[PDB]
Amino acid sequence: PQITLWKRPLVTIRIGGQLKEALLDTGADDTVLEEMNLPGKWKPKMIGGIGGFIKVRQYDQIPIEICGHKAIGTVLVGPTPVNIIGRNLMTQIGCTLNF
Amino acid sequence: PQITLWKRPLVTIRIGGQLKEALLDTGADDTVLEEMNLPGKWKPKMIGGIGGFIKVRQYDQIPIEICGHKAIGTVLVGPTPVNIIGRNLMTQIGCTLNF
Ligand SMILES: CC(C)CN(C[C@@H](O)[C@H](Cc1ccccc1)NC(=O)O[C@H]1CO[C@H]2OCC[C@H]21)S(=O)(=O)c1ccc(N)cc1
């Protein structure tokens, strides 16, 4: 689809058979989701945002379906103000900015 | 143009005598620029992201040129680590997300 920006670009995602709302975030290198359980091994990591650094759990090769478009990649789980889909996954689903 | 998300979507913006590199950021409601001493009335605000909040100065009706495209609107100014072009000005230069 084409998504305009007068409203937040919130989309429904599917991850582990759960439906969640996430923000398509072109300013985010990484995908960061609110606290949730994901299976498999994870690595402790730290990332920085506008307000400082947080601790996250890094899960690799996680499938997420974003508006029915399939991605498989790295998901960070931790204290984010909102679920955000970053460039790592937006690139996989073919997302570009256009003006 | 079409801006790839393989890399951070940095573009050149102008605000007065200053040329800056700024992210086209769909996850940012409002434009926030690195510390600079703009003229005019402003109001204090706190904006929040990953890591917590920063204090900013909200200036209204500030003209900014984004890759040659004219915009005018709210510009938040404060100790952000990166210059961010938010939705408020992206809409004005015709910017959509597409996949
Ligand atoms: C988290 C969002 C809901 C809001 N953020 C915009 C976001 O695009 C920032 C924009 C951003 C970018 C770099 C540094 C600080 C903020 N990105 C960000 O935190 O991404 C993190 C996840 O991937 C990593 O890559 C970049 C930092 C990490 S925000 O910067 O906090 C923000 C909040 C409010 C406004 N008005 C403007 C910006």
Coordinates of N, CA, C and O in Angstrom, one line a residue, chain A:
Chain A
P1 N 0.8 -1.2 0.0 CA 0.0 0.0 0.0 C 0.8 1.3 0.0 O 2.1 1.2 0.2
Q2 N 0.2 2.4 -0.2 CA 0.8 3.7 0.0 C 0.2 4.2 1.4 O -1.0 4.2 1.6
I3 N 1.1 4.7 2.3 CA 0.7 5.2 3.6 C 1.1 6.6 3.7 O 2.3 6.9 3.6
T4 N 0.1 7.5 3.9 CA 0.3 8.9 4.1 C 0.6 9.2 5.6 O 0.4 8.3 6.4
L5 N 1.1 10.4 5.9 CA 1.6 10.6 7.2 C 0.9 11.7 8.1 O 1.5 12.2 9.0
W6 N -0.4 11.9 7.8 CA -1.1 12.8 8.6 C -1.5 12.1 9.9 O -1.7 12.8 10.9
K7 N -1.5 10.8 9.9 CA -1.7 10.0 11.1 C -0.5 9.1 11.4 O 0.3 8.9 10.4
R8 N -0.3 8.6 12.6 CA 0.8 7.7 12.8 C 0.6 6.5 11.9 O -0.5 6.0 11.8
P9 N 1.7 6.1 11.3 CA 1.7 4.9 10.5 C 1.7 3.6 11.3 O 2.6 2.8 11.3
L10 N 0.6 3.4 12.0 CA 0.4 2.2 12.8 C -0.2 1.1 11.9 O -1.2 1.3 11.2
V11 N 0.4 -0.1 12.0 CA -0.1 -1.3 11.2 C -0.2 -2.5 12.2 O 0.4 -2.5 13.2
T12 N -1.0 -3.4 11.7 CA -1.2 -4.7 12.5 C -0.1 -5.6 12.0 O 0.2 -5.8 10.8
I13 N 0.6 -6.2 13.0 CA 1.6 -7.2 12.8 C 1.2 -8.6 13.4 O 0.4 -8.6 14.3
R14 N 1.7 -9.7 12.8 CA 1.5 -11.0 13.3 C 2.8 -11.6 13.7 O 3.8 -11.7 12.9
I15 N 3.0 -12.0 15.0 CA 4.2 -12.5 15.5 C 3.8 -13.6 16.6 O 3.1 -13.3 17.5
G16 N 4.3 -14.8 16.4 CA 3.9 -16.0 17.2 C 2.4 -16.2 17.3 O 1.9 -16.5 18.4
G17 N 1.7 -15.9 16.2 CA 0.2 -16.1 16.2 C -0.5 -15.0 17.0 O -1.7 -15.2 17.3
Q18 N 0.2 -14.0 17.4 CA -0.5 -12.9 18.1 C -0.6 -11.7 17.2 O 0.3 -11.4 16.4
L19 N -1.7 -10.9 17.3 CA -1.8 -9.7 16.6 C -1.5 -8.5 17.5 O -2.1 -8.4 18.6
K20 N -0.6 -7.6 17.0 CA -0.2 -6.4 17.7 C -0.2 -5.2 16.8 O -0.1 -5.4 15.6
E21 N -0.3 -4.0 17.4 CA -0.2 -2.8 16.6 C 1.2 -2.3 16.7 O 1.8 -2.2 17.8
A22 N 1.8 -1.9 15.6 CA 3.2 -1.4 15.6 C 3.3 -0.2 14.7 O 2.6 -0.1 13.8
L23 N 4.3 0.7 15.0 CA 4.5 1.9 14.3 C 5.7 1.7 13.3 O 6.8 1.3 13.7
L24 N 5.4 1.9 12.1 CA 6.4 1.9 11.0 C 7.3 3.1 11.3 O 6.8 4.3 11.2
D25 N 8.5 2.9 11.6 CA 9.4 3.9 12.2 C 10.7 4.0 11.4 O 11.7 3.3 11.6
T26 N 10.7 4.9 10.4 CA 11.9 5.0 9.5 C 13.2 5.6 10.2 O 14.3 5.4 9.7
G27 N 13.0 6.2 11.3 CA 14.1 6.7 12.2 C 14.7 5.6 13.1 O 15.6 5.9 13.8
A28 N 14.1 4.4 13.1 CA 14.6 3.3 13.9 C 15.5 2.4 13.0 O 14.9 1.9 12.0
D29 N 16.7 2.1 13.4 CA 17.6 1.1 12.7 C 17.0 -0.3 13.0 O 17.0 -1.2 12.1
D30 N 16.5 -0.4 14.2 CA 16.0 -1.7 14.7 C 14.6 -1.8 15.1 O 13.9 -0.7 15.3
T31 N 14.1 -3.0 15.1 CA 12.7 -3.3 15.5 C 12.7 -3.6 17.0 O 13.4 -4.5 17.5
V32 N 11.9 -2.8 17.7 CA 11.8 -2.9 19.2 C 10.3 -3.1 19.6 O 9.5 -2.2 19.4
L33 N 10.0 -4.2 20.3 CA 8.7 -4.5 20.7 C 8.6 -4.5 22.2 O 9.6 -4.7 22.9
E34 N 7.4 -4.1 22.7 CA 7.2 -4.1 24.2 C 7.3 -5.5 24.7 O 7.3 -6.5 24.0
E35 N 7.5 -5.6 26.1 CA 7.7 -6.9 26.7 C 6.7 -7.9 26.3 O 5.5 -7.7 26.3
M36 N 7.2 -9.1 25.9 CA 6.5 -10.2 25.5 C 7.4 -11.4 25.5 O 8.6 -11.3 25.6
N37 N 6.8 -12.6 25.5 CA 7.5 -13.9 25.4 C 7.8 -14.3 24.0 O 6.8 -14.3 23.2
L38 N 9.0 -14.6 23.7 CA 9.3 -15.2 22.4 C 10.2 -16.4 22.7 O 11.0 -16.4 23.6
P39 N 10.0 -17.5 21.9 CA 10.8 -18.7 22.1 C 12.2 -18.6 21.6 O 12.6 -17.7 20.8
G40 N 13.1 -19.5 22.0 CA 14.4 -19.6 21.5 C 15.4 -18.8 22.3 O 15.1 -18.1 23.3
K41 N 16.7 -18.9 21.9 CA 17.8 -18.2 22.6 C 17.7 -16.7 22.3 O 17.1 -16.3 21.3
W42 N 18.1 -15.9 23.3 CA 18.3 -14.5 23.1 C 19.6 -14.0 23.6 O 20.2 -14.7 24.4
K43 N 20.0 -12.8 23.3 CA 21.2 -12.2 23.8 C 20.9 -10.9 24.5 O 20.1 -10.1 23.9
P44 N 21.4 -10.6 25.6 CA 21.2 -9.3 26.2 C 21.9 -8.3 25.3 O 23.1 -8.5 24.9
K45 N 21.3 -7.1 25.1 CA 21.9 -6.1 24.3 C 21.5 -4.7 24.9 O 20.6 -4.7 25.8
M46 N 22.2 -3.7 24.5 CA 21.7 -2.3 24.9 C 21.6 -1.5 23.6 O 22.4 -1.5 22.7
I47 N 20.5 -0.6 23.6 CA 20.4 0.3 22.5 C 20.0 1.7 23.1 O 19.4 1.8 24.2
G48 N 20.3 2.7 22.3 CA 20.0 4.1 22.6 C 19.0 4.7 21.8 O 18.9 4.5 20.5
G49 N 18.2 5.6 22.4 CA 17.2 6.3 21.7 C 17.3 7.8 22.1 O 18.3 8.2 22.5
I50 N 16.2 8.5 21.9 CA 16.2 10.0 22.1 C 16.5 10.3 23.6 O 17.2 11.3 23.9
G51 N 16.1 9.4 24.5 CA 16.2 9.7 25.9 C 17.3 9.0 26.7 O 17.4 9.2 27.9
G52 N 18.1 8.2 26.0 CA 19.2 7.5 26.6 C 19.1 6.0 26.2 O 18.5 5.7 25.2
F53 N 19.8 5.2 27.0 CA 20.0 3.8 26.7 C 19.0 2.9 27.5 O 18.8 3.1 28.7
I54 N 18.7 1.8 26.9 CA 17.9 0.7 27.6 C 18.5 -0.6 27.3 O 19.3 -0.8 26.4
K55 N 18.1 -1.6 28.2 CA 18.5 -3.0 28.0 C 17.3 -3.7 27.2 O 16.2 -3.5 27.5
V56 N 17.7 -4.5 26.2 CA 16.8 -5.3 25.5 C 17.2 -6.7 25.4 O 18.4 -7.0 25.7
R57 N 16.3 -7.6 25.1 CA 16.6 -9.0 24.7 C 16.6 -9.1 23.2 O 15.6 -8.7 22.6
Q58 N 17.6 -9.6 22.6 CA 17.7 -9.7 21.2 C 17.4 -11.1 20.7 O 18.1 -12.1 21.1
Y59 N 16.3 -11.2 20.0 CA 16.0 -12.5 19.3 C 16.2 -12.4 17.8 O 15.8 -11.4 17.1
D60 N 16.9 -13.4 17.2 CA 17.2 -13.4 15.8 C 16.3 -14.3 15.0 O 15.7 -15.3 15.6
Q61 N 16.1 -14.1 13.7 CA 15.3 -14.8 12.8 C 13.9 -15.1 13.3 O 13.5 -16.3 13.3
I62 N 13.2 -14.1 13.7 CA 11.8 -14.1 14.1 C 11.0 -13.7 12.9 O 11.1 -12.6 12.4
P63 N 10.0 -14.6 12.5 CA 9.1 -14.2 11.5 C 8.1 -13.2 12.0 O 7.5 -13.3 13.1
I64 N 7.8 -12.1 11.3 CA 6.7 -11.2 11.5 C 6.1 -10.9 10.2 O 6.8 -10.6 9.2
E65 N 4.8 -10.9 10.2 CA 4.0 -10.6 9.0 C 3.5 -9.2 9.2 O 2.7 -8.9 10.1
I66 N 3.9 -8.2 8.3 CA 3.5 -6.8 8.5 C 2.6 -6.4 7.3 O 3.0 -6.4 6.2
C67 N 1.3 -6.1 7.6 CA 0.3 -5.9 6.6 C 0.3 -7.1 5.6 O 0.2 -6.8 4.4
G68 N 0.5 -8.3 6.0 CA 0.5 -9.4 5.1 C 1.8 -9.6 4.3 O 1.8 -10.5 3.4
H69 N 2.8 -8.9 4.7 CA 4.1 -9.0 4.0 C 5.0 -9.7 5.0 O 5.2 -9.2 6.2
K70 N 5.7 -10.7 4.6 CA 6.5 -11.6 5.4 C 7.9 -11.0 5.6 O 8.6 -10.7 4.6
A71 N 8.3 -10.9 6.9 CA 9.7 -10.7 7.2 C 10.2 -11.7 8.1 O 9.4 -12.3 8.9
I72 N 11.5 -12.0 8.1 CA 12.2 -12.8 9.2 C 13.5 -12.1 9.6 O 14.4 -12.0 8.8
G73 N 13.5 -11.7 10.8 CA 14.7 -11.0 11.3 C 14.8 -10.7 12.7 O 14.2 -11.4 13.6
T74 N 15.7 -9.8 13.1 CA 16.0 -9.5 14.5 C 14.9 -8.6 15.1 O 14.6 -7.6 14.6
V75 N 14.5 -9.1 16.3 CA 13.5 -8.3 17.1 C 14.1 -8.1 18.4 O 14.7 -9.0 19.0
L76 N 14.1 -6.9 18.9 CA 14.5 -6.5 20.2 C 13.3 -6.3 21.1 O 12.3 -5.7 20.7
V77 N 13.3 -6.9 22.3 CA 12.2 -6.8 23.2 C 12.7 -6.0 24.4 O 13.7 -6.3 25.1
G78 N 11.9 -4.9 24.8 CA 12.3 -4.1 25.9 C 11.4 -2.9 26.1 O 10.4 -2.8 25.4
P79 N 11.8 -2.0 27.0 CA 10.9 -0.8 27.3 C 11.0 0.3 26.3 O 11.7 1.2 26.4
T80 N 10.1 0.1 25.3 CA 9.9 1.1 24.2 C 8.6 1.8 24.5 O 7.7 1.1 25.0
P81 N 8.4 3.1 24.2 CA 7.1 3.7 24.4 C 6.0 3.0 23.5 O 4.8 3.1 23.9
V82 N 6.3 2.4 22.4 CA 5.4 1.7 21.5 C 6.1 0.7 20.7 O 7.3 0.9 20.5
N83 N 5.5 -0.3 20.2 CA 6.1 -1.3 19.3 C 6.5 -0.5 18.1 O 5.6 0.2 17.5
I84 N 7.7 -0.7 17.7 CA 8.2 0.0 16.5 C 8.9 -1.0 15.5 O 9.7 -1.8 15.9
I85 N 8.5 -0.9 14.2 CA 9.1 -1.6 13.2 C 10.2 -0.7 12.6 O 9.9 0.3 12.0
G86 N 11.4 -1.2 12.7 CA 12.6 -0.4 12.1 C 13.0 -0.8 10.7 O 12.4 -1.7 10.1
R87 N 14.0 -0.2 10.2 CA 14.5 -0.4 8.9 C 14.9 -1.8 8.6 O 14.7 -2.3 7.5
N88 N 15.4 -2.5 9.6 CA 15.9 -3.9 9.4 C 14.7 -4.8 8.8 O 15.0 -5.6 8.0
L89 N 13.5 -4.6 9.3 CA 12.4 -5.3 8.7 C 11.6 -4.6 7.6 O 11.1 -5.2 6.7
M90 N 11.5 -3.3 7.6 CA 10.9 -2.5 6.5 C 11.6 -2.7 5.2 O 11.0 -2.8 4.1
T91 N 13.0 -2.9 5.2 CA 13.7 -3.2 4.0 C 13.2 -4.6 3.5 O 13.1 -4.7 2.2
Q92 N 13.0 -5.5 4.3 CA 12.6 -6.9 3.9 C 11.3 -6.9 3.1 O 11.1 -7.6 2.2
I93 N 10.4 -6.0 3.6 CA 9.1 -6.0 2.9 C 9.0 -4.9 1.8 O 7.9 -4.7 1.3
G94 N 10.1 -4.4 1.4 CA 10.2 -3.5 0.3 C 9.7 -2.0 0.5 O 9.4 -1.4 -0.5
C95 N 9.8 -1.6 1.7 CA 9.3 -0.2 2.1 C 10.3 0.9 1.8 O 11.5 0.8 2.2
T96 N 9.9 1.9 1.0 CA 10.7 3.1 0.7 C 9.9 4.3 1.1 O 8.7 4.2 1.3
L97 N 10.6 5.4 1.2 CA 10.0 6.7 1.4 C 9.9 7.4 0.0 O 10.8 7.2 -0.8
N98 N 8.8 8.1 -0.3 CA 8.6 8.7 -1.6 C 8.0 10.1 -1.4 O 7.0 10.3 -0.7
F99 N 8.6 11.1 -2.1 CA 8.0 12.4 -2.2 C 8.3 13.1 -3.5 O 9.0 12.5 -4.4

